[PDB]
Write an enzyme that holds these catalytic residues in place. Structure first.
Site, PDB file in Angstrom:
ATOM      1  CG  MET A 167     -11.517  14.807   6.542  1.00 14.39           C
ATOM      2  SD  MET A 167     -11.335  13.971   4.943  1.00 14.39           S
ATOM      3  CE  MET A 167      -9.656  13.364   5.060  1.00 14.39           C
TER       4      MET A 167
ATOM      5  CD  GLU B  73      -7.287   2.219   5.734  1.00 15.19           C
ATOM      6  OE1 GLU B  73      -7.030   3.392   5.347  1.00 15.19           O
ATOM      7  OE2 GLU B  73      -6.411   1.347   5.936  1.00 15.19           O
TER       8      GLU B  73
ATOM      9  CD  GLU C 233      -1.709   6.758   0.381  1.00 13.60           C
ATOM     10  OE1 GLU C 233      -0.872   7.588   0.849  1.00 13.60           O
ATOM     11  OE2 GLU C 233      -1.564   5.502   0.393  1.00 13.60           O
TER      12      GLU C 233
ATOM     13  CE1 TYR D  56       0.426   8.347   8.574  1.00 15.62           C
ATOM     14  CE2 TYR D  56       1.217   8.160  10.797  1.00 15.62           C
ATOM     15  CZ  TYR D  56       0.242   8.536   9.919  1.00 15.62           C
ATOM     16  OH  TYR D  56      -0.914   9.090  10.407  1.00 15.62           O
TER      17      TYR D  56
ATOM     18  CG  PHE E 267       2.015   1.029   4.379  1.00 16.24           C
ATOM     19  CD1 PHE E 267       2.086  -0.111   3.618  1.00 16.24           C
ATOM     20  CD2 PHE E 267       1.568   0.932   5.687  1.00 16.24           C
ATOM     21  CE1 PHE E 267       1.706  -1.325   4.133  1.00 16.24           C
ATOM     22  CE2 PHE E 267       1.169  -0.280   6.211  1.00 16.24           C
ATOM     23  CZ  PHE E 267       1.245  -1.415   5.433  1.00 16.24           C
TER      24      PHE E 267
HETATM   25  C1  LIG Z   1       7.648  -2.273   2.795  1.00 18.40           C
HETATM   26  C2  LIG Z   1       7.422  -3.688   2.308  1.00 18.40           C
HETATM   27  O1  LIG Z   1       8.147  -4.183   1.454  1.00 18.40           O
HETATM   28  N1  LIG Z   1       6.367  -4.393   2.825  1.00 18.40           N
HETATM   29  C3  LIG Z   1       5.428  -3.894   3.847  1.00 18.40           C
HETATM   30  C4  LIG Z   1       4.650  -5.027   4.518  1.00 18.40           C
HETATM   31  C5  LIG Z   1       3.822  -5.796   3.506  1.00 18.40           C
HETATM   32  N2  LIG Z   1       2.483  -5.242   3.311  1.00 18.40           N
HETATM   33  C6  LIG Z   1       1.494  -5.020   4.242  1.00 18.40           C
HETATM   34  C7  LIG Z   1       0.275  -4.540   3.776  1.00 18.40           C
HETATM   35  C8  LIG Z   1      -0.719  -4.364   4.742  1.00 18.40           C
HETATM   36  C9  LIG Z   1      -2.053  -3.854   4.296  1.00 18.40           C
HETATM   37  O2  LIG Z   1      -2.466  -4.063   3.167  1.00 18.40           O
HETATM   38  N3  LIG Z   1      -2.695  -3.058   5.153  1.00 18.40           N
HETATM   39  C10 LIG Z   1      -3.922  -2.380   4.778  1.00 18.40           C
HETATM   40  C11 LIG Z   1      -3.681  -0.875   4.784  1.00 18.40           C
HETATM   41  O3  LIG Z   1      -4.931  -0.165   4.765  1.00 18.40           O
HETATM   42  C12 LIG Z   1      -2.800  -0.384   3.641  1.00 18.40           C
HETATM   43  N4  LIG Z   1      -2.599   1.069   3.700  1.00 18.40           N
HETATM   44  C13 LIG Z   1      -1.641   1.482   2.671  1.00 18.40           C
HETATM   45  C14 LIG Z   1      -1.517   2.991   2.612  1.00 18.40           C
HETATM   46  C15 LIG Z   1      -1.004   3.471   3.941  1.00 18.40           C
HETATM   47  C16 LIG Z   1      -0.195   4.598   4.020  1.00 18.40           C
HETATM   48  C17 LIG Z   1       0.411   4.947   5.208  1.00 18.40           C
HETATM   49  C18 LIG Z   1       0.198   4.188   6.337  1.00 18.40           C
HETATM   50  C19 LIG Z   1      -0.634   3.083   6.288  1.00 18.40           C
HETATM   51  C20 LIG Z   1      -1.246   2.710   5.094  1.00 18.40           C
HETATM   52  C21 LIG Z   1      -2.136   1.485   5.027  1.00 18.40           C
HETATM   53  N5  LIG Z   1      -0.518  -4.634   6.031  1.00 18.40           N
HETATM   54  C22 LIG Z   1       0.695  -5.072   6.361  1.00 18.40           C
HETATM   55  N6  LIG Z   1       1.737  -5.285   5.542  1.00 18.40           N
HETATM   56  C23 LIG Z   1       4.544  -5.889   2.170  1.00 18.40           C
HETATM   57  C24 LIG Z   1       6.042  -5.745   2.366  1.00 18.40           C
HETATM   58  C1  LIG Z   2      -1.887   8.165   5.091  1.00 15.05           C
HETATM   59  S1  LIG Z   2      -3.081   6.825   5.443  1.00 15.05           S
HETATM   60  C2  LIG Z   2      -4.506   7.752   6.096  1.00 15.05           C
HETATM   61  C3  LIG Z   2      -4.190   9.118   6.719  1.00 15.05           C
HETATM   62  O1  LIG Z   2      -5.314  10.027   6.786  1.00 15.05           O
HETATM   63  C4  LIG Z   2      -5.504  10.507   8.081  1.00 15.05           C
HETATM   64  N1  LIG Z   2      -6.894  10.694   8.272  1.00 15.05           N
HETATM   65  C5  LIG Z   2      -7.826   9.706   8.259  1.00 15.05           C
HETATM   66  N2  LIG Z   2      -9.035  10.119   8.451  1.00 15.05           N
HETATM   67  C6  LIG Z   2      -8.900  11.459   8.597  1.00 15.05           C
HETATM   68  C7  LIG Z   2      -9.819  12.482   8.838  1.00 15.05           C
HETATM   69  N3  LIG Z   2     -11.121  12.302   8.945  1.00 15.05           N
HETATM   70  N4  LIG Z   2      -9.361  13.715   8.945  1.00 15.05           N
HETATM   71  C8  LIG Z   2      -8.065  13.932   8.811  1.00 15.05           C
HETATM   72  N5  LIG Z   2      -7.104  13.052   8.600  1.00 15.05           N
HETATM   73  C9  LIG Z   2      -7.576  11.831   8.494  1.00 15.05           C
HETATM   74  C10 LIG Z   2      -5.036   9.354   8.954  1.00 15.05           C
HETATM   75  O2  LIG Z   2      -4.977   9.754  10.294  1.00 15.05           O
HETATM   76  C11 LIG Z   2      -3.741   9.049   8.183  1.00 15.05           C
HETATM   77  O3  LIG Z   2      -2.821  10.059   8.432  1.00 15.05           O
END
Ligand SMILES: CC(=O)N1CCC(Nc2cc(C(=O)NC[C@H](O)CN3CCc4ccccc4C3)ncn2)CC1
Ligand SMILES: CSC[C@H]1O[C@@H](n2cnc3c(N)ncnc32)[C@H](O)[C@@H]1O
Ligand SMILES: CC(=O)N1CCC(Nc2cc(C(=O)NC[C@H](O)CN3CCc4ccccc4C3)ncn2)CC1
Ligand SMILES: CSC[C@H]1O[C@@H](n2cnc3c(N)ncnc32)[C@H](O)[C@@H]1O
Lengths: 303, 304, 322, 322
Positions: free
Chosen positions: D105, D129, D120, D9, D12
């Site tokens: 949800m 996802e 998101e 978290y 990202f």
């Molecule tokens: C900080 C920073 O400079 N760098 C972070 C590390 C690097 N980047 C990544 C990207 C991914 C990648 O694309 N993963 C797929 C995920 O589904 C992406 N989403 C994004 C939204 C989200 C929000 C909250 C938590 C998770 C996610 C996952 N893996 C690992 N390293 C770039 C440098």
């Molecule tokens: C912020 S990246 C995706 C976020 O959505 C939440 N999430 C994914 N799928 C669901 C779902 N079906 N219901 C509620 N939260 C979800 C994940 O647990 C994560 O916090």
């Protein structure tokens, strides 16, 4: 002695017809497990809620008869590589339904056709059904020796037939099968049911097939010439291809209606038996090695 | 009625009106222990489909894929058996007897149409053959293998004995003239479209016809103009007996539509609960249209 | 998760003592549910939950005629290949009395509630084909006073020493998976060259209908088996017992085995590692029934005379799909 | 099926361009949904479906203040460890404006329907996802005229030749499983020593809310990629593009890549076996999105210039849990 089968798309009473073909001289039957015209919808109402039953009942035959005498047949409207989305989706549902019913019944083999070039979505569904559930049902891919299009009559005035020899265009059907088989990652459960047309193709086409897993060979009544008496027979090149197949040891299958209405239907079968007995005799290598065919041994290390 | 069977099979495949006003229906059993077919004549149409209130009934050996009226007593039948059979009506029109049953096709016979002569017919099959039959002689005059897939529909021109249409799952529409040494000639789009499924000649222009495809679109052609009428395959198309005819269209979406000449919809019915298989117009009441489906319904429509 | 083949149904349908036990349970329940003076005014709603090809439907018809009462039948089945058999039977024989439903009982919205729900969802270890989960998802269409047949079932366990069966589980090692996975799964097996070391004792029990406010089909049971010989433990045998209705019962427990009932063989929970056991010691085995939203599985461990390792943690080797 | 750790978290969340793009999508939607004369009478119901630790909640607050409109916020999250963060934020900062919900949800019964649902749930290949399945189970509490942010997303594919990455997937072979399983799964990877052979083309597209009468998230797409060099194919690169609202977009497609957005790396669908490709030939790849009641997976195959084998049939190597 020759293992022999009869193909039909019309079986009103399963008990009756199975008896009549068995009395003809046949070892087994290729029929559809569902009615080939009974098209079924799985998505849109109101047709999807059509009231059952969808097909005839498993009790009409013993476990032994379904296991040794019947061979399934995929309905001909089931087309998973259609260009229409709705059709592809219904055909996927229908394929799974018919193949799972064959598994339910215990069928030793199940027929599916390779009549066009793209059979990718068809392959995938088969691959999934293979890997879903525990069974050993075999699948006989019905692929023609020459493609319908390359066999048609030159009677379309404004779209004639290519009279230019095409080397690799005449090997079209093999690539349909090589693709289908490669997509399914060479499953031992997938075999080829080679359909034999009226006019045979250049020897090279025939040569590129007997490396393949042929388990059945399909002969229609329309290719049989009539002889002096009134019996159905086969040309000499067709007979040579037969001799090849009996050497490769396969199950012959007769399809089509009786075209020699002067003699009954077992005459085709008797012609087959005839050639079997009248084949080039087996020598000492062929008599002795028989039974060891394509059997893999680690090699002897006598040191 | 004597010789009638007690039950008519659930899947009504074909329905055709005779000039006087009788309704001929042909039914096939597509599910269950026995897979046979049956032919029925109802001199009263509103009585259909009661087995007790019919003028004549009989049962064939196998299902009925398609049939057509040969005159006023003959009935041409396309059997799954691979046979084309001709059944004729009794003198009193109470019985139905097989006159010939010829097994020439190597797979389900799916289409029959009668040529303008009435002594000749043409059949299409799943074996990829089209055959031209002499109903008198009871033999096949010619056997054509022009298509590269199962023959879906054949429709004989209403006025020329030599000319008829065919369409197949090989994306081909052929126009035929038995007088040419290459009888068949390929019509259609510049580019590969969707498979054609239904063919209807126009009853007043000898070079115009309509075809419907597996995607639910009906089109009008002259040896352009098209509308998406149905969501699913167009199983048949039938012209009304009017001075200026109305086009009836049938689909596997269990609906019926009636179109004009710019193919603008005018009537819409969803009374049917299963595939709507055949449609026939009344020769007495021209705004009346009878439809049969796989839901054992014989439904009569009041068309504007 | 998987649909049974036609011959499977056929073999387990040919067991007479089972289906006649079911007939009699239905008979006794019909009598105790409508008196002689309602025998023509009162139609009982019967729902066969998991109907197969129709042996429970026929035994319901036979029981209703033994007991001279009126019933309305529903044959709920999930396997559509078996529904083809049911719908052909309903056409040419049962008629309108039986209403065939091709649905999962947990998912089926019913027209009316039931007086009696008949089920045959029992395995060699009672709940191992997930009778609980299914009937809990189907009791919402049960009359507030309704009767489930069967009404309860209990699983049983007994420690065994068999060097033959230990070697056979050992040989069940398969490539592309855990080399010890084969000991972390139960087997339906007709035990023969084995030694039962202590009399079976009850493990998990389930009751239908379960009127608890929070239904929890998970379980934890601890059993102590006194052994009076030296021996070497190789696994635990599993048996079951079920109350169809009142004194009508079915069992594959060797003490109270229903005679001539070949429908259920016993089950076998092996242990990875043989555990040597002395005269007079006690064998302590723990058993867990665990589930999530998607699958259900058994975990088990031996704690006395020496600990074993928790077998099948997380369903990593064996799970029963919902 | 798995819950994200706290530092995931955190990393990202530190991407500014993404969350400000989301802020502006919310801003434009708020303006077009209530005119200047309702700016004090009309409170918009906003539901963050998949709220995390609260970056979308804060960007919703910031957008509502940019656009001078009233909003009612709901922060729906499934991971309870992240809910601990949300509920502490709601106590000491957001106050009563935000209503925190710790539920899935698809499973949450909502008090009132929403004007806007923010999500998101997007992966490197858009739907990987399972954004579709979740939002389809949550649109029932959307106003009949409601707006989903994002409103649509499209996945993209491009054939690549990389001998480095082919060797690395090869080295990803693990014991106790299929020796070829590693090529039957996608990888999130920052592609570097690789050769893109043809420009990305769109694969699967999804729209929210989906008002089709039968929703089917399964897919089948066939793509043809003309290559103008000799080369040897080793896999396919995956990218995505998404419409948040109107002209506000996010993308990791290299042609239209959102600048300075490190949140998504590309994905990689390898093929077991390198496929040699000549100057002028075309690469035909087929892709399927398959699902059952429990999981969702991708199958894929190459059909031109030579067939490959259907990869991941039945999800046997890789599946995304529901
Ligand atoms: C900080 C920073 O400079 N760098 C972070 C590390 C690097 N980047 C990544 C990207 C991914 C990648 O694309 N993963 C797929 C995920 O589904 C992406 N989403 C994004 C939204 C989200 C929000 C909250 C938590 C998770 C996610 C996952 N893996 C690992 N390293 C770039 C440098
Ligand atoms: C912020 S990246 C995706 C976020 O959505 C939440 N999430 C994914 N799928 C669901 C779902 N079906 N219901 C509620 N939260 C979800 C994940 O647990 C994560 O916090
Ligand atoms: C005929 C006959 O003499 N013999 C049949 C074979 C043999 N016995 C068995 C028993 C089991 C065993 O116990 N399996 C566990 C199952 O859950 C049992 N239930 C029974 C109810 C039922 C009903 C319909 C379909 C399936 C089932 C499964 N396996 C295989 N062979 C005895 C000889
Ligand atoms: C006769 S042995 C068990 C029978 O019950 C059926 N069955 C099992 N579980 C269910 C279920 N949840 N819903 C409906 N039928 C079921 C099985 O498919 C089989 O026919």
């Amino acid at each position: 002695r020759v293992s022999s089968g009869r193909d039909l798309n019309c079986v009103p009473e399963i008990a009756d017809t199975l008896g009549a073909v068995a009395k003809q001289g046949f070892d087994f039957l290729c029929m559809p497990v569902f009615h080939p015209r009974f098209k079924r919808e799985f998505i849109q109402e109101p047709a999807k809620n059509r009231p059952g039953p969808q097909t005839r009942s498993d009790l009409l035959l013993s476990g032994r008869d379904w296991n040794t005498l019947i061979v399934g047949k995929l309905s001909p409207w089931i087309r998973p590589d259609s260009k229409v989305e709705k059709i592809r989706r219904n055909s996927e549902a229908a394929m799974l339904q018919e193949l799972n019913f064959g598994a339910y019944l215990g069928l030793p083999a199940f027929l599916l056709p390779l009549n066009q070039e793209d059979n990718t979505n068809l392959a995938r569904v088969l691959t999934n059904h293979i890997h879903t559930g525990h069974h050993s049902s075999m699948f006989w891919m019905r692929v023609p020796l020459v493609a319908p299009e390359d066999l048609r009559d030159d009677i379309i005035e404004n779209a004639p037939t290519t009279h230019t020899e095409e080397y690799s265009g005449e090997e079209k059907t093999w690539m349909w099968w090589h693709n289908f088989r490669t997509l399914c990652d060479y499953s031992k459960r997938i075999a080829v049911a080679l359909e034999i047309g009226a006019d045979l193709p250049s020897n090279h086409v025939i040569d590129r097939w007997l490396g393949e897993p042929i388990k059945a060979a399909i002969l229609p009544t329309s290719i049989f010439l009539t002889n002096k008496k009134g019996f159905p027979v086969l040309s000499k090149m067709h007979q040579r291809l037969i001799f090849r197949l009996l050497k490769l040891e396969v199950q012959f299958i007769i399809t089509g209606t009786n075209h020699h209405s002067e003699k009954e239907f077992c005459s085709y079968l008797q012609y087959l038996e005839y050639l079997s007995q009248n084949r080039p005799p087996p020598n000492a290598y062929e008599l002795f090695a028989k039974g060891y065919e394509d059997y893999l041994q680690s090699p002897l290390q006598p040191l | 009625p004597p010789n009638a069977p007690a039950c008519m099979e659930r899947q009504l495949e074909a329905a055709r009106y005779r000039s006087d006003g009788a309704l001929l229906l042909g039914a096939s059993s597509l599910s269950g222990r026995c897979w046979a077919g049956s032919l029925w004549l109802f001199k009263d149409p509103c009585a259909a489909p009661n087995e007790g209130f019919c003028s004549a009934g009989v049962q064939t050996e196998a299902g009925v894929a398609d049939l057509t009226w040969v005159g006023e007593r003959g009935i041409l039948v396309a059997s799954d058996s691979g046979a084309v059979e001709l059944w004729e009506l009794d003198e009193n029109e109470t019985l139905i007897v097989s006159k010939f049953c010829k097994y020439e096709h190597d797979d389900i016979v799916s289409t029959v149409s009668v040529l303008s002569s009435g002594t000749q017919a043409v059949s299409g099959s799943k074996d990829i053959c089209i055959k031209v039959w002499d109903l008198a002689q009871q033999v096949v005059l010619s056997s054509y293998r022009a298509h590269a897939a199962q023959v879906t529909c054949v429709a004989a021109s209403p006025h020329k004995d030599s000319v008829f249409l065919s369409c197949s799952e090989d994306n081909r529409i052929l126009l035929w003239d038995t007088r040419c040494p290459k009888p068949a000639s390929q019509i259609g789009c510049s580019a590969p479209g969707y498979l054609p499924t239904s063919l209807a000649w126009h009853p007043q222009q000898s070079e115009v016809f309509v075809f419907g495809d597996e995607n639910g679109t009906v089109s009008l052609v002259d040896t352009v103009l098209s509308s998406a009428v149905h969501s699913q395959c167009v199983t048949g198309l039938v012209f009304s007996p009017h001075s200026v005819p109305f086009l009836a269209s049938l689909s596997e979406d269990c609906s019926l539509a009636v179109l004009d000449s710019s193919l603008s919809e005018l009537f819409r019915s969803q009374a049917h609960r299963d595939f709507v298989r055949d449609a026939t117009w009344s020769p007495l009441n021209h705004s009346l249209l009878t439809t049969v489906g796989w839901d054992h319904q014989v439904v009569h429509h009041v068309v504007p | 998760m998987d649909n049974l083949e036609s011959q499977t149904y056929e073999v387990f349908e040919k067991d007479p003592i089972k289906y006649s036990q079911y007939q009699q349970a239905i008979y006794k329940c019909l009598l105790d549910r409508v008196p002689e003076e309602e025998k023509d005014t009162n139609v009982q709603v019967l729902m066969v939950l998991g109907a197969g090809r129709g042996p429970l439907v026929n035994a319901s018809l036979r029981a209703a005629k033994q007991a001279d009462r009126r019933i309305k039948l529903y044959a709920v089945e999930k396997n559509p290949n078996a529904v083809v058999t049911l719908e052909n039977w309903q056409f040419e024989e049962w008629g309108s009395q039986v209403t065939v439903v091709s649905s999962d009982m947990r998912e089926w919205v019913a027209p009316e509630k039931a007086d009696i729900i008949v089920s045959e969802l029992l395995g060699s270890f009672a709940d191992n084909e997930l009778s609980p989960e299914c009937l809990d998802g189907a009791q919402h269409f049960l009359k507030d006073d309704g009767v489930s047949i069967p009404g309860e079932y209990t699983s049983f366990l007994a420690p065994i020493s068999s060097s033959k069966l230990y070697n056979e589980v050992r040989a069940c090692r398969e490539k592309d998976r855990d080399p010890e996975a084969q000991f972390e799964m139960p087997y339906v097996v007709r035990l023969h060259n084995f030694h039962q070391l202590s009399a079976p004792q009850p493990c998990f029990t389930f009751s239908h209908p379960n009127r608890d406010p929070m239904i929890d089909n998970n379980r934890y049971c601890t059993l102590e088996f006194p052994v009076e010989v030296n021996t070497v433990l190789h696994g635990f045998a599993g048996y079951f017992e079920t109350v169809l209705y009142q004194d009508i019962t079915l069992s594959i427990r060797p003490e109270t085995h229903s005679p001539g009932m070949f429908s259920w063989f016993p089950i076998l929970f092996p242990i990875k590692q043989p555990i040597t056991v002395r005269e007079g010691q006690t064998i302590c085995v723990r058993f867990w029934r665990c589930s999530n939203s998607k699958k259900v599985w058994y975990e088990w461990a031996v704690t006395a005379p020496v600990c074993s390792a928790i077998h099948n943690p997380t369903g990593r080797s064996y799970t029963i799909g919902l």
